Design an enzyme around this catalytic site. Structure first.
Site, PDB file in Angstrom:
ATOM      1  N   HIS B  40       0.819  -1.218   0.000  1.00  0.00           N
ATOM      2  CA  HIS B  40       0.000   0.000   0.000  1.00  0.00           C
ATOM      3  C   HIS B  40       0.853   1.268   0.000  1.00  0.00           C
ATOM      4  CE1 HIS B  40       0.288  -0.399   4.470  1.00  0.00           C
ATOM      5  NE2 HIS B  40       0.283   0.919   4.428  1.00  0.00           N
ATOM      6  N   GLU B  52      19.319   7.476   8.029  1.00  0.00           N
ATOM      7  CA  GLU B  52      18.576   8.564   8.661  1.00  0.00           C
ATOM      8  C   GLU B  52      18.313   8.409  10.152  1.00  0.00           C
ATOM      9  OE1 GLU B  52      17.793  11.317   7.532  1.00  0.00           O
ATOM     10  OE2 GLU B  52      16.838  11.403   5.573  1.00  0.00           O
ATOM     11  N   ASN B  54      17.426  11.935  12.256  1.00  0.00           N
ATOM     12  CA  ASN B  54      16.516  13.072  12.234  1.00  0.00           C
ATOM     13  C   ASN B  54      16.140  13.234  10.761  1.00  0.00           C
ATOM     14  OD1 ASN B  54      15.412  15.715  11.948  1.00  0.00           O
ATOM     15  ND2 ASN B  54      16.503  16.387  13.779  1.00  0.00           N
ATOM     16  N   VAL B  57      16.701  17.057   9.161  1.00  0.00           N
ATOM     17  CA  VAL B  57      17.950  17.782   8.964  1.00  0.00           C
ATOM     18  C   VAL B  57      19.035  16.844   8.467  1.00  0.00           C
ATOM     19  CG1 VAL B  57      17.299  18.801  11.227  1.00  0.00           C
ATOM     20  CG2 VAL B  57      19.619  17.907  10.921  1.00  0.00           C
ATOM     21  N   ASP B  84       0.248  -7.861   1.453  1.00  0.00           N
ATOM     22  CA  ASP B  84       0.677  -6.471   1.516  1.00  0.00           C
ATOM     23  C   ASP B  84       2.189  -6.411   1.628  1.00  0.00           C
ATOM     24  OD1 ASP B  84       0.653  -3.714   1.684  1.00  0.00           O
ATOM     25  OD2 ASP B  84      -0.170  -3.630   3.730  1.00  0.00           O
ATOM     26  N   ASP B 171       1.856   1.067  20.107  1.00  0.00           N
ATOM     27  CA  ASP B 171       1.472   0.544  18.795  1.00  0.00           C
ATOM     28  C   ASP B 171       2.133   1.321  17.635  1.00  0.00           C
ATOM     29  OD1 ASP B 171       0.013  -1.119  17.094  1.00  0.00           O
ATOM     30  OD2 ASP B 171      -1.909  -0.107  17.406  1.00  0.00           O
ATOM     31  N   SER B 172       1.933   0.843  16.405  1.00  0.00           N
ATOM     32  CA  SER B 172       2.430   1.530  15.218  1.00  0.00           C
ATOM     33  C   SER B 172       1.314   2.524  14.879  1.00  0.00           C
ATOM     34  CB  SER B 172       2.694   0.543  14.065  1.00  0.00           C
ATOM     35  OG  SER B 172       1.838  -0.577  14.128  1.00  0.00           O
ATOM     36  N   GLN B 174       0.085   6.027  11.832  1.00  0.00           N
ATOM     37  CA  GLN B 174       0.295   6.605  10.495  1.00  0.00           C
ATOM     38  C   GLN B 174       1.708   7.118  10.292  1.00  0.00           C
ATOM     39  OE1 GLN B 174      -3.012   6.741  11.573  1.00  0.00           O
ATOM     40  NE2 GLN B 174      -3.512   5.326   9.920  1.00  0.00           N
ATOM     41  N   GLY B 175       2.343   6.637   9.224  1.00  0.00           N
ATOM     42  CA  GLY B 175       3.713   7.010   8.921  1.00  0.00           C
ATOM     43  C   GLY B 175       4.691   5.867   9.186  1.00  0.00           C
ATOM     44  N   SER B 177       3.896   2.541   8.293  1.00  0.00           N
ATOM     45  CA  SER B 177       3.674   1.513   7.265  1.00  0.00           C
ATOM     46  C   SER B 177       4.935   1.153   6.480  1.00  0.00           C
ATOM     47  CB  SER B 177       2.606   1.950   6.266  1.00  0.00           C
ATOM     48  OG  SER B 177       1.294   1.577   6.646  1.00  0.00           O
ATOM     49  N   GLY B 178       5.101  -0.141   6.199  1.00  0.00           N
ATOM     50  CA  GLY B 178       6.249  -0.608   5.442  1.00  0.00           C
ATOM     51  C   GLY B 178       7.487  -0.848   6.276  1.00  0.00           C
TER      52      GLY B 178
HETATM   53 CA   LIG Z   1      18.750  13.362   8.362  1.00  0.00          CA
END
Ligand SMILES: [Ca+2]
Lengths: 56, 223
Positions: B40, B52, B54, B57, B84, B171-172, B174-175, B177-178
């Site tokens: 999805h 990554e 942060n 920045v 999925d 819990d997990s 929005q953001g 996913s995957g």
């Molecule tokens: Ca960064």
């Protein structure tokens, strides 16, 4: 009228920015779509949103 | 991630951010040129961001690489959310080190009770919105198929598992996913769907990776 329905994020956990027609403000606004089970008031751009729902 | 903790810079070296002008999903690096995520999360123009911490920045350990191919499972069902899973090929291979590294695919499925690490840059509030700058982590156990099916009647397939706490609060969201669900150093799940975030009696649902290992290995090799 699907243009009058509130925005639907859905059960999925993505953070995808989409547009929905906000009849109260009379404009298309952004909202967070979860990635699945989209309803019709969910557009990829403000232009698509205005063309489909503008003035509803 | 709701109710988690700050992982610490590059302590989850296999975690990637999928960016389309902003972070929209997570993913896991399985080898120097391939990333696994949720079906999805499929989108055109994906840029994968590695190393990554942060996400807002530039800290110097990043590698931004565009996706060359995005392969969604042939049987992914957008309605039931079954299968999925998606594979993303990087345009060029990432440089692997200690801040960027791949995660191993599972040799077998994990059992109920196994403790796993879930990570992501998703919403940290169950009621509200607060997206973090740094990567958040959460330790959660895999739940039995029986309880998972009780929480979501007629919606759980053999390719999904629940993980979390029935009390809610962790819990997990929005953001996320995957993103990865890693147990004993092996990638066992992919953040997929749920019912709100961190609600009591509604644990998150994850793609059961152990069922796709054959498909993953062969697909990666023929692309
Ligand atoms: Ca960064």
């Amino acid at each position: 009228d699907f243009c009058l329905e509130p925005p639907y994020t859905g059960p999925c956990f993505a953070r995808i920015i989409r547009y929905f027609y906000n009849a109260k403000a009379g404009l298309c606004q952004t909202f967070v779509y979860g990635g699945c089970r989209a309803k019709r008031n969910n557009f990829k751009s403000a232009e698509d949103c205005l063309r489909t729902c503008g003035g509803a | 991630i709701v109710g988690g903790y700050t992982c610490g810079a590059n302590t989850v070296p296999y975690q990637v951010s999928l960016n389309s002008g902003y972070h929209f999903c997570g993913g896991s690096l399985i080898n120097s040129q391939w990333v696994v995520s949720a079906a999805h999360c499929y989108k055109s123009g994906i840029q994968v961001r590695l190393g990554e911490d942060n996400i807002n920045v530039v800290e110097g350990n990043e590698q931004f690489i565009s996706a060359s191919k995005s392969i969604v499972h042939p049987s992914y069902n957008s309605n039931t959310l079954n299968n999925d899973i998606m594979l993303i090929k990087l345009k060029s291979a990432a440089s692997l080190n200690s801040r960027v590294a791949s995660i191993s695919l599972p040799t077998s499925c994990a059992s109920a009770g196994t403790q796993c690490l879930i990570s992501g840059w998703g919403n940290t509030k169950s009621s509200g919105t607060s997206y973090p700058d740094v990567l958040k982590c959460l330790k959660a156990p895999i739940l039995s198929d029986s309880s998972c099916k009780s929480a979501y009647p007629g919606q759980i397939t053999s390719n999904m598992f629940c993980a979390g706490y029935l009390e809610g609060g962790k819990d997990s969201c929005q953001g996320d996913s995957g993103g990865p669900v890693v147990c004993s150093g092996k990638l066992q799940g992919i953040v997929s769907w749920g019912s709100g975030c961190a609600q009591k009696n509604k644990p998150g649902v994850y793609t059961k990776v152990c069922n796709y290992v054959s498909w993953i290995k062969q697909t990666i090799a023929s692309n």
